[PDB]
Amino acid sequence: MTRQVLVTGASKGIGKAIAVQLAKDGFHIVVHYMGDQQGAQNTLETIEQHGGSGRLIQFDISNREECRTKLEADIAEHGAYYGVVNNAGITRDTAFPAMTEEEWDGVIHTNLDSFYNVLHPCVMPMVQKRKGGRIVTLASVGLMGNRGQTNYSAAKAGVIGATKSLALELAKRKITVNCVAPGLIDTGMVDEHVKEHAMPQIPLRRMGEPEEVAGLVSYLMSDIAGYVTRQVISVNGGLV
Amino acid sequence: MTRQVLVTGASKGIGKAIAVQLAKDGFHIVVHYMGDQQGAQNTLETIEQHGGSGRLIQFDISNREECRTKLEADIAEHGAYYGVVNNAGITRDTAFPAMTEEEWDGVIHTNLDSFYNVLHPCVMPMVQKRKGGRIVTLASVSGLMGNRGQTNYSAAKAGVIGATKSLALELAKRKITVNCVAPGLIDTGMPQIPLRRMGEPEEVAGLVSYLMSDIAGYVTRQVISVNGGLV
Amino acid sequence: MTRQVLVTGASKGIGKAIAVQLAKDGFHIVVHYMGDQQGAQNTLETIEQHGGSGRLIQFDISNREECRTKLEADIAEHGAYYGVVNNAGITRDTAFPAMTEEEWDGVIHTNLDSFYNVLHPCVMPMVQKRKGGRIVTLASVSGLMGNRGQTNYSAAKAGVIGATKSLALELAKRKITVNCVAPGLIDTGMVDEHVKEHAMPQIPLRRMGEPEEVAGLVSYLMSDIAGYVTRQVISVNGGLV
Amino acid sequence: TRQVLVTGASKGIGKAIAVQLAKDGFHIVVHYMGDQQGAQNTLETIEQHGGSGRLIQFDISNREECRTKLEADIAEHGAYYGVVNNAGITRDTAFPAMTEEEWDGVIHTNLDSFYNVLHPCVMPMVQKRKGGRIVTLAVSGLMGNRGQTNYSAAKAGVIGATKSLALELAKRKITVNCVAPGLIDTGMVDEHVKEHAMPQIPLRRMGEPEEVAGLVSYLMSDIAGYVTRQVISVNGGLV
């Protein structure tokens, strides 16, 4: 009966807004967090006070072994997830010639390897339950490239390509696979010089809110969105 | 403080499903038709059956002066639309070497010139109400990727995409989102589609519904595909 | 065997550069013009003076019947074209609310209807000659992402791209490739300078392109080794998009 | 006077590119990892037809080997004018069955490639102040796979890296583009793949390596200096 949705990074910002909204939609939210147990608990309590249901889960997304262990156990105990939302991390400009090995490797392995680390333990349980499903990845913002971000652009484009290929793979199981690509989102601590930097590039001349990303994820998660797959959809105020 | 949404081609198929879903969403639907009054009436009947509301309107999207006259009179009587859904459009499939003048022109006119004919009388009244707004055009996977026998249709729908993105840039400062919905193959009465089925009219309407919703206010200048994974 | 290539709008700028370069490549160029006869003869004289061959043709790409008559007569007399470069176009820039009927219609029916008006008389002869061929349409970055004050131009060029892809699919088995070239901002001379450096910061290369730089990509697509490139829209825009 | 590194030039597309770019007049650095026979023949063919070049060996998966060999080669001969970074061969694996090693290995070979080969080359190029050309090579467009999430992730990542680097080096008159071939007849193509793919290809034939090399030749050419940040597909209409 009940449909469970794992939301990574649901202790803060975009992941928290997604978790709250999907709980409102009726999904049993698995609120994931890395270190911030207080924030995850806050998310879950917000969910419960607005009439929904969920539970916490903890793992470090860059720790593949830990991801597998915690997810396989949570799944063995509670059943396969109907949905998996894989949220993104932050970026830091660095010009390619100046870029160090660690900057390249770290960006690639935190932003691209998390696709495998989080989704591999989750996909076949979802297939085996044969009730369809939903997978939604999120970009750091992937389609266009950006100065000083060859590593983050490679990672984000990689996620997009992995997402689309997996969409082709899982189409026959009635699991939709889509990527959401937000523009500049106001998550509460963004640099002023960042706002200053990009606001003229944004037709709507304003930052997006986390709830605005969550609305798009809520749509993709909904039953009527079952013919939408293999897509990367941007919520960026017209930036691109 | 009712919010009115014009839906062209709403007497049948995708247009009908959009009109019905948006009425369920709480919008007052202006059900447009050209000759299919019976279909339009059935749409409005269903709208009221679900507890919604709306009204009919008649014009030929290809007749620019008729469009302007009827739309401006409707806006005079009831106020400006909050949303416009530009859905009407025909196909005249054929090999390009065999394609006639009529087969080219009719497709361009009904599919692409309707952008100007329907939206031009509607934009400034929308802007002047200073309450934001929504414009959703309809294209096709054909417009994104090309398709044999559809040089005309692919041209017209790709053109709708380009016009839509431009208008998005123009109207963003009034908080009016402008987006385009590109359905794949829709069953309105197959091994190249990953989901291995045709789409349903309601599945197009669901995406139009999302775009018409208040929480979609930061999505603009987009062409979003509901196509089973074709592209 | 001589291969004829029609080049619309070849009296000036990009069309001229394409005509001159293709003549250098060895193609017999049909230099088309609408009103600018002297520019077209300038193009043909350049071609001739570097040892190439060509001939003029006149018609208005807006006038479908004139296009058909002139192209059918030229092809009846000289045989089917091997290549067609659909280059000619117009802009009528305006914000959408202020845009007139004629500013919308003129752009759609000159830039987008051109596809049918020029290519329909030319495709079946090309196919019938069973030698393969080349069709290259010219669009714009405006038709890829949209631009303020260009709902009409963006629509027409996006439409050109969609038609190009569909025709590519129809003709692929005929060994005719069909592609679209999308230039960025090209220095055609006398280009308005406010427009110019308003556009400079969007262009990574921090310069406008040269007509020869567009002609070089058309020249590549026209070449035999490009026979596996079709259904593509290729941008020459200094990294704009 | 203008040197071009061509990785994977011992065979197939890489060989075709090396041969053609040498006919265009570039001095080709013919790279190989294990296929020394093939690279020797690539260089010998170049020289027989009146061109010039030299061999270089390294494993593109070994960042250290790449850096040492490329820095040494550049120190002796000066920075490359062009770098062509070719792609490996694809493999089917359903995502559920895919192993840690299949994922990590494809990312490491097909994506980290970008850093391992290009990073030693970019700043020297910039410092020579003669402009330059970088071309990455993505096999794309096919339908009906049993899964290629890792290869498609790496190829999409290469495209993103390429476009971003294009943005960085635009000011330096260095163009950076990606070429995405369809199904190319390298002589080692599975019969099953030919059968399944051909009805999806409007041209109804595989491409020839020389048809990819012609597009690389165009991008390397001086007249192509206004083409940058692009992915250009040579695929017979596949997509």
Side-chain angles (χ1 to χ4, degrees), chain A residues 2-44 46-89 91-92 94-143 145-155 157-188 191-192 195 198-240, chain B residues 2-231, chain C residues 2-189 193 195-196 198-241, chain D residues 1-194 196-239:
Chain A
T2 38
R3 299 195 297 188
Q4 313 182 57
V5 179
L6 171 76
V7 188
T8 62
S11 52
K12 85 215 175 171
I14 283 165
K16 178 195 284 287
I18 287 161
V20 168
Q21 183 55 44
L22 296 185
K24 286 187 203 320
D25 297 344
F27 293 100
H28 194 69
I29 312 290
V30 191
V31 177
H32 155 272
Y33 70 92
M34 180 161 58
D36 183 15
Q37 193 188 11
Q38 177 180 251
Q41 184 55 231
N42 287 340
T43 298
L44 176 53
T46 291
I47 286 168
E48 288 170 350
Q49 275 164 17
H50 289 86
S53 69
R55 79 170 164 269
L56 311 180
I57 189 167
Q58 188 285 329
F59 48 83
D60 189 302
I61 273 166
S62 311
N63 186 334
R64 180 174 299 155
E65 214 191 38
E66 178 168 68
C67 291
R68 177 178 30 98
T69 296
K70 306 293 285 254
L71 290 164
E72 282 180 10
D74 187 72
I75 280 169
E77 173 77 358
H78 286 113
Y81 307 117
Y82 177 78
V84 178
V85 188
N86 211 24
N87 280 282
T91 63
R92 307 197 232 146
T94 296
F96 185 68
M99 181 192 282
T100 75
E101 299 190 22
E102 287 81 4
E103 296 171 312
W104 176 269
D105 293 341
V107 172
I108 294 293
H109 295 342
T110 61
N111 303 359
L112 192 47
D113 275 328
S114 68
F115 184 99
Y116 188 95
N117 295 358
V118 169
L119 295 188
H120 196 262
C122 295
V123 163
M124 187 47 77
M126 184 180 300
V127 170
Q128 283 177 348
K129 202 165 185 232
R130 279 172 332 279
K131 294 252 175 55
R134 291 289 186 278
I135 296 175
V136 179
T137 60
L138 286 87
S140 52
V141 153
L143 320 159
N146 214 358
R147 285 182 187 71
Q149 277 190 352
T150 61
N151 55 350
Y152 294 102
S153 298
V159 168
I160 286 167
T163 299
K164 282 197 188 191
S165 174
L166 189 63
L168 297 182
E169 215 180 303
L170 297 182
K172 71 186 77 69
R173 306 293 180 188
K174 324 216 278 165
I175 296 161
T176 68
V177 184
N178 295 287
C179 181
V180 161
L184 177 63
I185 304 308
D186 177 15
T187 44
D191 194 48
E192 253 294 355
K195 303 173 29 79
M199 212 66 90
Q201 322 155 20
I202 306 181
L204 288 173
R205 298 289 144 79
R206 76 159 167 94
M207 293 213 270
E209 306 294 318
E211 291 81 10
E212 274 163 336
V213 179
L216 174 58
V217 175
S218 179
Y219 167 72
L220 290 173
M221 281 302 298
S222 78
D223 286 355
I224 197 66
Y227 207 54
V228 175
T229 200
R230 196 187 180 185
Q231 304 304 306
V232 47
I233 303 170
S234 294
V235 47
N236 61 18
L239 187 83
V240 70
Chain B
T2 85
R3 292 198 297 184
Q4 299 171 104
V5 172
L6 176 67
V7 178
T8 62
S11 77
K12 84 191 181 139
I14 287 159
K16 174 183 294 285
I18 288 168
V20 167
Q21 186 52 50
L22 292 183
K24 273 159 75 209
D25 293 338
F27 295 105
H28 185 74
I29 319 278
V30 188
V31 183
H32 154 271
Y33 67 101
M34 180 167 65
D36 188 9
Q37 182 190 260
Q38 185 60 74
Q41 288 168 329
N42 292 342
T43 300
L44 185 49
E45 173 185 85
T46 296
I47 282 171
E48 291 200 2
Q49 262 184 20
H50 289 163
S53 72
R55 61 166 176 279
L56 308 172
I57 191 156
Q58 188 281 327
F59 50 81
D60 179 357
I61 51 171
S62 292
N63 178 349
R64 165 175 302 134
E65 201 259 17
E66 182 179 60
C67 278
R68 188 180 65 248
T69 298
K70 299 290 280 262
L71 291 171
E72 289 190 327
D74 197 53
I75 291 165
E77 181 167 348
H78 303 280
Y81 314 118
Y82 172 77
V84 179
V85 182
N86 221 45
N87 162 77
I90 69 163
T91 71
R92 308 267 304 253
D93 294 355
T94 172
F96 176 82
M99 176 176 306
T100 67
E101 293 188 37
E102 318 92 274
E103 277 168 340
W104 177 267
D105 285 338
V107 173
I108 301 301
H109 289 170
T110 63
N111 275 275
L112 180 54
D113 282 338
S114 64
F115 191 96
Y116 186 95
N117 290 1
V118 176
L119 296 183
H120 196 268
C122 289
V123 164
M124 281 217 292
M126 182 178 293
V127 169
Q128 193 279 332
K129 306 330 155 216
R130 297 300 195 162
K131 284 293 221 332
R134 294 285 188 276
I135 296 175
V136 179
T137 58
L138 277 289
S140 158
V141 63
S142 181
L144 294 170
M145 272 184 334
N147 195 38
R148 292 186 75 148
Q150 303 197 299
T151 49
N152 51 357
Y153 189 67
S154 73
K157 293 312 222 187
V160 164
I161 290 175
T164 300
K165 290 169 160 171
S166 289
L167 187 58
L169 299 179
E170 284 185 39
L171 304 185
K173 56 203 160 253
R174 331 291 197 185
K175 311 171 172 200
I176 292 166
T177 70
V178 192
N179 296 287
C180 176
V181 163
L185 181 63
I186 313 290
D187 183 6
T188 36
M190 43 191 126
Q192 75 195 235
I193 309 185
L195 288 185
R196 278 314 184 281
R197 69 167 171 90
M198 292 205 277
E200 298 295 326
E202 291 80 2
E203 274 163 337
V204 177
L207 176 54
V208 176
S209 177
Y210 166 66
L211 294 174
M212 281 298 306
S213 79
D214 290 353
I215 202 63
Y218 203 61
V219 176
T220 198
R221 194 205 191 162
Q222 299 313 304
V223 53
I224 305 169
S225 283
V226 51
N227 63 19
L230 264 176
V231 81
Chain C
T2 59
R3 299 189 293 194
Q4 302 177 104
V5 176
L6 177 63
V7 184
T8 60
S11 64
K12 71 191 210 245
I14 285 164
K16 184 196 280 304
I18 290 169
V20 164
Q21 184 53 57
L22 297 184
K24 287 194 186 341
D25 295 349
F27 297 103
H28 184 83
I29 320 289
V30 186
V31 185
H32 150 276
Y33 67 99
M34 194 202 64
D36 190 8
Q37 191 211 103
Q38 188 61 63
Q41 179 76 18
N42 284 166
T43 302
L44 182 56
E45 271 163 20
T46 299
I47 291 171
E48 284 169 345
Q49 283 165 28
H50 295 92
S53 43
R55 70 169 173 275
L56 304 178
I57 193 167
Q58 187 284 334
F59 50 80
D60 189 326
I61 60 162
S62 307
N63 183 332
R64 175 176 303 151
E65 300 68 19
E66 175 167 80
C67 289
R68 185 181 49 236
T69 302
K70 294 273 210 181
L71 290 168
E72 284 180 357
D74 194 65
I75 290 175
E77 171 158 46
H78 300 277
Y81 310 125
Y82 177 82
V84 176
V85 187
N86 232 21
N87 168 78
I90 58 165
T91 71
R92 296 295 286 97
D93 293 359
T94 317
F96 184 68
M99 182 177 299
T100 62
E101 305 197 19
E102 298 84 8
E103 284 163 326
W104 173 271
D105 283 344
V107 170
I108 292 312
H109 296 326
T110 297
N111 288 6
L112 179 52
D113 278 356
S114 95
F115 194 101
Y116 188 93
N117 293 347
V118 172
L119 296 182
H120 193 267
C122 295
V123 167
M124 175 274 281
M126 186 181 289
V127 171
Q128 218 166 63
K129 216 158 136 173
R130 276 164 196 200
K131 264 144 132 60
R134 294 286 188 276
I135 294 152
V136 177
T137 62
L138 279 275
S140 175
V141 50
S142 151
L144 304 185
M145 61 206 219
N147 189 31
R148 278 183 186 73
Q150 289 199 309
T151 55
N152 52 354
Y153 190 69
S154 297
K157 289 316 204 165
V160 162
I161 287 167
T164 293
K165 292 167 176 185
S166 294
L167 185 58
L169 298 177
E170 288 182 21
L171 301 189
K173 189 56 178 298
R174 315 273 90 76
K175 305 200 217 205
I176 293 165
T177 72
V178 185
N179 292 294
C180 177
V181 169
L185 183 50
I186 311 304
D187 184 1
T188 44
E193 186 119 9
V195 172
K196 166 189 179 126
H198 181 251
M200 211 45 48
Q202 293 149 50
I203 297 146
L205 286 199
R206 297 305 195 273
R207 70 176 170 84
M208 302 184 286
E210 299 297 327
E212 287 73 19
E213 286 169 321
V214 178
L217 169 58
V218 182
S219 171
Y220 164 70
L221 293 169
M222 283 300 311
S223 76
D224 294 338
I225 196 55
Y228 209 59
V229 171
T230 195
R231 198 191 185 174
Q232 300 311 301
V233 58
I234 300 162
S235 283
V236 48
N237 56 23
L240 199 51
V241 68
Chain D
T1 197
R2 303 203 292 192
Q3 303 172 104
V4 175
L5 174 63
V6 186
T7 75
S10 76
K11 55 174 151 92
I13 292 164
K15 184 195 274 298
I17 291 163
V19 173
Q20 178 65 46
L21 292 196
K23 186 201 209 153
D24 296 341
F26 300 101
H27 185 82
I28 310 326
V29 189
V30 175
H31 155 274
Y32 68 97
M33 184 214 286
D35 188 11
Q36 178 179 44
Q37 231 173 31
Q40 291 168 328
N41 263 325
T42 298
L43 177 59
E44 170 71 22
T45 289
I46 287 165
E47 290 179 339
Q48 286 173 9
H49 298 308
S52 55
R54 60 164 180 285
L55 305 177
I56 196 166
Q57 189 278 332
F58 53 81
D59 176 0
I60 64 162
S61 300
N62 187 327
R63 181 176 289 147
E64 171 71 86
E65 223 209 339
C66 287
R67 194 177 21 87
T68 301
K69 297 285 205 117
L70 291 165
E71 275 176 9
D73 195 70
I74 291 175
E76 165 161 20
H77 300 280
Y80 311 114
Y81 174 81
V83 179
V84 189
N85 201 28
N86 275 285
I89 290 179
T90 187
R91 223 181 271 172
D92 259 27
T93 324
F95 183 72
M98 181 179 296
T99 74
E100 292 195 32
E101 283 87 11
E102 281 159 348
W103 173 269
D104 286 342
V106 164
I107 295 307
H108 178 52
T109 295
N110 291 24
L111 180 42
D112 283 344
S113 41
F114 191 95
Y115 189 92
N116 297 342
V117 170
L118 292 180
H119 199 265
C121 295
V122 166
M123 194 54 202
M125 194 175 299
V126 164
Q127 271 161 330
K128 194 132 191 33
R129 295 166 82 208
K130 304 283 191 63
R133 298 282 188 274
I134 295 161
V135 184
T136 59
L137 279 283
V139 66
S140 78
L142 282 174
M143 313 161 231
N145 285 133
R146 184 196 131 216
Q148 273 160 23
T149 53
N150 53 359
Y151 289 99
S152 300
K155 142 179 155 70
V158 165
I159 289 163
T162 296
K163 296 177 157 191
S164 168
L165 188 64
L167 291 176
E168 289 183 36
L169 306 176
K171 59 181 85 153
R172 315 278 163 200
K173 309 195 207 306
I174 305 185
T175 72
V176 188
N177 296 288
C178 180
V179 169
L183 190 57
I184 301 308
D185 191 355
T186 72
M188 324 192 286
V189 179
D190 190 320
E191 213 53 48
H192 182 244
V193 180
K194 300 181 189 182
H196 179 78
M198 216 59 30
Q200 315 173 58
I201 301 179
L203 261 287
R204 302 294 198 251
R205 66 160 171 98
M206 287 193 280
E208 298 297 324
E210 291 82 5
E211 285 171 323
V212 177
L215 171 62
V216 173
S217 175
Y218 164 70
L219 292 184
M220 284 292 316
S221 77
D222 286 350
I223 198 57
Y226 209 61
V227 179
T228 198
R229 196 193 184 187
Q230 306 301 310
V231 191
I232 302 162
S233 297
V234 47
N235 62 14
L238 193 52
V239 295

